[PDB]
């Protein structure tokens, strides 16, 4: 309960600082060719060519049966593919006409606008069932807002903004109808319906708030700034949006870590960024949270979590492969003054020149024009401290100058997209995973619900952890780490994992600690049991070519990198193959990965283990 936005301003403040008549718009007038040419640079010929490919595009109708099919079989794409094709065509035509300015794409822009007004709804078939009737087919008497419609509305709102005058010379009824449509589909419902789930008014402990909140609020805000010219109404809308986005800010951890990982980052933190940018532009910079430390940390998480060559930290149900929109990361970094994020975005270009963002997100497409020149000039660098420590999320990243990156966590077995992974770690060498975290599989019916933890990728058994007295970690809020420390100077992470295990595990304490020096990672386990009932087992997950050249040495060679894992000789080491049937995994790891199991006949109440990993 920080309520940063409500603290920065109330409705009265708003009315005083809002900029009317779209005077906040940062792009040249459509008629201002010279300014368009300077801004566009070599985006110009590129966008013109993209536009030219759409001069005979046939606007796709979406049939009733395409919406009905979501109820019949679960099929989303039958409806979404034509929808998105139309939305991308309209977005591209907008950029091409800005680029050229000779009227050549105006007729297709007009067609696209008009057809969109004729559609009963801009809501995806998969989301329409939130409406009162609970059906997947649009109900012409009612509109809700979803991720799609919000974006559709904002795009239409921008097309109205740039092309009203040429449209009106052709026939003023087109722009009239667009204003009515955006009113019925965005403005009205946004103001009149308090109960949309992603707005999070009336939010209750236990309910979820997620990326839908800053994403939909950012799209709504644009529609208001572009289309609502009554200031009393506008101030009320904007204020409503700040109270709504305050709920998201409130729920997010202050340390800046996105515990869903980097593939939500873009539409989570990145749409919070978008929202604050639009809110700042809309108030002449007077209502801005972009200087807040927390916002900078949310941005930088993308940088710190990105190991290299596509590989990212992937605690929880998250892909080990990752990436980002470099242009967005730049604009975010510039806005919160992170040179790290700006250098990072240039590194993420992989030596390409930055061009306009295409797709269907008007705001991002337009904003990408403003940033291309500067990002093109930025020096590519992925620098960062040796240690990043997120104390509230309990994620610790530690690196050395000879290519080792370790990610470790404390936490609790009820995070978003939870894996039972209190205490785990991941090791990368020159960006390549060497001790890995499997990550996300294809969804089944067992994925949510009891039985979630019957899927192997969610079990502690298949993370880099012990089975204490042969027992794994248990799912649940109070199965958790205690006394997690990170000593940033010495690169020591340490946590007691005992409480993440159930009573059957009969453990008092188990301290799992990671130390990273310039050449090597040392893992230690120091444990006290209530009763020695079964041998403990220690597991490590890996891939490539694994060899066992003597007791207790394992060598791992993968993608050019080579390590040795030194383990206590009381342990017998075995390698189990895990043939990957699931494409969502085999597309990251290939055909198979391995669990190294370490098993003993010894049983005692007290013990410690040391393991050491170094390059060779
Ligand atoms: Zn995992």
Numbering used by the authors: 28 to 643
Could you pull the original sentences from the published paper?
Crystal structures of BtPL33HA and BcPL33HA reveal a two-domain structure. The C-terminal domain possesses an extended loop region between β-strands 5 and 6 (Leu455-Leu484: BtPL33HA, and Ile464-Leu493: BcPL33HA), forming an octahedral Zn2+ coordination site [supported by anomalous X-ray diffraction data], along with the loop region between α-helices 12 and 13 from the N-terminal domain. The two domains oppose each other in such a way that a deep, open-ended cleft is formed resembling an active site that would be compatible with an endo-processive mode of action of BtPL33HA and BcPL33HA. Analysis of the five enzymes via SEC-coupled light scattering and SAXS indicated that the three PL33_1 enzymes BtPL33HA, BcPL33HA, and BsPL33Heparosan are dimeric, while the PL33_2 enzymes ObPL33CS and ObPL33Gellan are monomeric. SAXS data indicate that the dimeric enzymes all bind as head-to-head homodimers, generating elongated envelopes. This is consistent with PISA analysis of the crystal structures of BtPL33HA and BcPL33HA which predicted a buried surface area of ~1,388 Å2 and 1,006 Å2, and a complex significance score of 0.207 and 0.290, respectively. The phenol of Y470 moves within 5 to 6 Å of the +1 GlcA and N-acetyl of the −1 GlcNAc, while F475 moves within 5 Å of the +2 GlcNAc, forming the tunnel topography. This differs significantly from the wide-open cleft observed in the crystal structures of both BtPL33HA and BcPL33HA. Fitting of both the BtPL33HA and BcPL33HA crystal structures and their AF2 models to SAXS data indicated that the best fit was for the open conformation observed in the crystal structures. Next, we performed molecular dynamic simulations to determine the extent of PL33 conformational plasticity, using the BtPL33HA crystal structure model.
